[PDB]
Symmetry: D4
Subunit: 235 residues, 8 copies
């Protein structure tokens, strides 16, 4: 029972590793002509849509650092397990960024698709955008998993896939698509470049927390015990 | 039981707010090259597809003003509850349009994607187009929710997502994509500009009403009591 | 019971009318720049994907003339009911083509997206292409509806949507996308132009028949009575 | 019972034949302008998504040679049945490549979309890319079919469709999209051209095997008997 | 002295032959993506700019049938010599169209760039456009050659090159670029297709005549003898 | 001698009429894909380059209202003759705009290419841009005509053509290309729309005057009599 | 006097070296989106236009191997001097191709823009195209230099620039632009690849010879002594 | 005579100011779609082509810092006059960069078109490219002005215009177009950013010096006195 908890860490490590490799790989600058924004955005989404199928089955499939905290603040996971996914995700993000670098040609690779802030957009406007991107994403994942609802949501994994597709397509223009610290983290480190890299952690975390609370405190509450459930933290 | 009815108003307010923010945000003029019509259209659809998952679960997820009336004329909702969603939607539409404005750069924003009538297209042709766009959309949402059918419709929420994708892609060319008063409403007000803005209310409302009746009076009727069901209006 | 059979004819009439209006409308020549082939193809698919949800529930949702015959040759429908859908579809196709014409500007409309044979492609090569396009489409729809399989096919209606997306995207290049007589029929008549218009009827019909037999005589047979089932023709 | 096993070989032959015809047909060089990478990639995916619906129902629907071995190494199939699918797939791949050739015009066809290695990319980098492309694809198909999980995966067939869409979109740039020996095989033979054609067999096979083991030995094991199950090989 | 007159006929035959081969060759349908209108237009211009250098030196370099008449009505050439250039030009146009056909692939060639009238544009609007296109072209060539002006016009041959570039770029949209009967003539005959082909002869001839008179009767007259000069017709 | 002065007015009327017809005609909205800015810009230039050849020979060839004043302030023309060209130009501009309207289809024509101010650009920034555009244009035309310099300027008319090409290409982005009141004037009147239309008169006039003085008072002065030359105003 | 002849060899060596470096450098594969054919074609032309100014002044400026022979067959140069330019050109072509290789990134460079024969085009059709491309080019250069004509040809060097622009733009599609053995030679050798490389030598040489004779034996002969002039060969 | 020397400094100041304003202004990031490389490159060329007409007449028109030194090393100018142009050019470059900044919107402006080194290209490869770009440019300007040659070079100013067009088009890809310190200087200072900014000074200066010597010591020497001419330095 103890070791089984560890496999989930692998699912999260491999899932994120693949997530960063395919999507960040999709960004690679070789589009000067068509607006690859349709492509890159579409790539992150299909990457996430599929990972959810292989990974989520085993355990979670969060992949996104900001999204994991959403579940923790969501009150339904151990504080340690939360920390386990974040480190598995960051390392997973870099493991992927590391390989993508080795495989793509010099002229092809630039900063490995480093989240570049849009000329006109200011730092404050960039944060709010990140706030809303994750809020919708988290709100989508939260409902999708919500057992309470049997209904006919259909491909719950595919549902999440498109939800992310929306965030990136839009996010791509304002803040070079973010809504995920892992995504922003790998390019900066694997290419010694840290600038506004914090707005990316700040918006998604606030967004995730905000988006998480919105589903609970309001939208679709847990008709049981709020104070009692918060015991998961103690194990 | 009384207050619970109010949360649904929030679901509709937040859903529409997000709906207008992401899709209208997608339109922003920065495509002069590729035909963003594929993008913008695709954006409104994924935005709607996802909102249906988070919002619909709690209550409705109509988002579209013309679509809400379809349900009311559809005979299965209180007249007051209908009015509650429309105001929640319009305000939600503006709340989103308001934020999108603050975040996008000056050169980027124009009229915040104001539904501009296509050069050649006349006002009459623009209305019929709006009539058909909503009719198909309403007809799709109506069937999707129709409990009667168990079958294997699959991701009912995703189904609605693509249905709207079709309306906008086509709508984008003739009347700068409409089929939703809320979508048309936010840009006009948040950018003091009212022109043909009525064709947008006129076509979608007629379309919604027409599309709603088509599913009932004909297609797939309610094998119970038509006169008896109309009692929901009285509560 | 007698009149109820007639409503199905309406579902097929409205479904096709909408099918031709949205997809053929999507083709309209105003893309000289991006390769609208991605768009037009994508449009026919979403149009079909959605119609299946509203229409199929009530009855069939074939929409495609060649596809209806597939079911008839498929041995599971009355010969008269088959004829009823074809005429409902052709008229539905024209009803849509008629309205699309009235609404689109002169410069916009050309031949209303008349299936133009590709310069190099010969008449024989154009037929085989049509043969394969419908075969896959019919084979997809046949399995989708096959009750025998409970499984987890998921959104059966959405499944059909993409299947058609494939046919049109490919079909668009060789024979200006066909695989549907109704689609080919409306532009030719609503714009007095008949040329190779037969290859379109010939390939899809052969394809549909061929594709239909493949699923039965081989692939997934009906483990019951082949000779007995053929009694549906007599009613 | 003996002959029934043979029909599965047909499902695999027809499925692959169609798979190569539609996707490879989509690649045909006539895009010099838009970045058909979005198209071609999208085509292979919808082609696979749909085949899974018609073919998988009858038996398997692997289509991909490297993917079939994944199931064999996956320990749950007869060694002979595995060999039966590979030959049915290769022949099916060529049967399709053969027809595509006859139908497309001379100027249109080049090498029938022969997997051309990207200028800068070296042979070693091309292999690793192929390794990761198939690993994710196999891992996706493996989970999708995994009975153990009832859940709400939704359209299991559509899920696989997008998963492949990701591999090709990315694969298209580095190694002209591979992740499938059959896809790489048809163009080389139907156009006497063999170069680096081995990297394609090498990466997908390693990837498939690697991806297969990852799901078992780790991720989601078979809580029964590993040594006992390996008896399927003996029949 | 008699035979020398004949060489001029060759200069005109070869000049036009090359003119139609390069420009019409430039039109060939293989641009679906970028707007080759910039290309095709640019091609006709450089083709004309250069021919003027090799051909004009020997004799004339009119190339354009409508332009030759401009000089004849311009009062400064024998009526027979005028007829000699027209037949040399038409044959030259076809000689070029004939070879272009033999060399370009089947899929490439369509109607050999047959002047296709623009969907919306009516026959009357198409004529006026042709009227203005040639008027400016003729007016440009007339001044360029006008000995009277020594000045510093510079590359008189290059001047004419761009003047034509303007006509075609604009002409390309309304009437698939015309302003030259020879250009319109070759595709129609070398591809049995005659439709509105007369508007092309009608507009350029009227335009040429009109443009010719404008330079004389008004703009820059011949300060000598108008009635006396008209004796060139008699030899 | 008196009537001869009048022909110059015709040269200016026809020149401008053609100038507005070809260039404004080039702008017509049908580019959504490629960046017609290269085209439209290129069109105005070739249009001007050629007019200079036919028109300038007879008299002036200013075409641009702001440019005519440059010559008047340039001290070398009668005040009345200056007024004669401006009215001939404005009427000429409209005469052209009038015909362009009648010939282009409804869907094609919008505002007849009305100088639309760029979203972000403010009114003040739009004026300075106009100031610099005309200054360079005037400075170029001034030198070109400057008899004093024999040298080898080459095609003086072609030189002016490209100079204008630069102004429009750049001008097109900030203020929808202006640098010419006539160009800005025709669309506004022929399509009842006056907005910021003054910035266009203000910048080019200031620019022209400023650019004119720069060549005289500084750059290349008139080594004769400044006070004496100013007598041309008195005739 | 003896050594001075040698400097001309340098002018030809440097001219060609630069010619191949800039134009072939322009081809480099990084355009997948816009149709760089406009670019690449335009590049070879400006490269040639300018070289003619620096190089031609000193001696010749042929640059093109096939073009040099045109002058030799043109009867006006020593047989040895002809051989001197060809070797200076080939070496110059490689010297340039060598440096371009060292400077461009791996992923960027492919075959260094190796003249790739167009899919559909056959070897015979590829030769005729090359025949006509050089004929017009040679005919243009021949007239340009022809002292006999004083006239107002204008920028003789610029005239040649555009003439070549035409050949390459057209040539680019059929035979990946050739009309110059040097251009075809450098990529093949600097990238061990020889295929159809002969059609390139065959067409341009035939074309050059043919084009050369056309200007003499016919067009604009040398009204002096044909047999006497052929003495230049003897010195 | 003393003050007259100063006006030349103004011609150089205004010329460069305009040069940087128009060309750098052309670069502004708003092309993501078409390959503005054709545009930006074309802009710098027309900007230079025209300035040469207004400025060169008065004095020089060098505009390019590296080009001025070419003339100084070219032995035909005072050492002080050389220094006067460089400072007039740098200040002129900034004066232009300063205004361009104030006028373009925030979102539009980025780094004001700061010469960004191409991902793959290394610092050494970037220098050689700069070396060759200026060498050809200087060699072109040198010949153009060379009095010795009367001939028919034509529009000497236009000749220089295209020569630069070539350098920038090519230069744009490798080192974001340089070949001019002034061009590279303005963006770095007006946007506190200095990186590899030296390679730009290093390559153009070496190139200019090298290109200058090539025309003298070899190509077309000065058949007079080399040691005597070097006296200009002393005045």
């Amino acid at each position: 029972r103890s070791a089984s908890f560890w496999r989930a860490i692998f699912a999260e490590f491999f899932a994120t590793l693949f997530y960063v490799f395919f999507g960040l790989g999709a960004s690679l600058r070789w589009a000067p002509g068509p607006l690859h924004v349709l492509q890159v955005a579409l790539a992150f989404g299909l990457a996430l849509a599929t990972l959810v199928q292989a990974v989520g089955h085993i355990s979670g499939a969060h992949v996104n650092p900001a999204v994991t905290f959403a579940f923790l603040v969501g009150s339904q996971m151990s504080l340690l397990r939360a920390i386990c996914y974040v480190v598995a995700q960051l390392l997973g993000a870099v493991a992927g960024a590391a390989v993508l670098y080795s495989v793509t040609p010099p002229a092809v690779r630039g900063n490995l698709a480093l989240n570049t802030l849009h000329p006109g957009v200011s730092v404050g406007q960039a944060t709010i955008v990140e706030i809303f991107l994750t809020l919708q994403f988290v709100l989508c994942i939260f409902a999708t998993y919500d057992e309470r609802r049997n209904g006919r949501l259909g491909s719950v994994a595919l549902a999440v896939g498109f939800s992310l597709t929306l965030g990136h397509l839009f996010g791509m223009y304002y803040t070079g698509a973010g809504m995920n610290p892992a995504r922003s983290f790998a390019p900066a480190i694997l290419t010694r470049n840290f600038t506004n890299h914090w707005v990316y952690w700040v918006g998604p975390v606030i967004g995730a927390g905000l988006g998480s609370l919105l589903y609970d405190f309001l939208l679709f509450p847990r008709l049981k015990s709020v104070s009692e459930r918060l015991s998961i933290l103690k194990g």
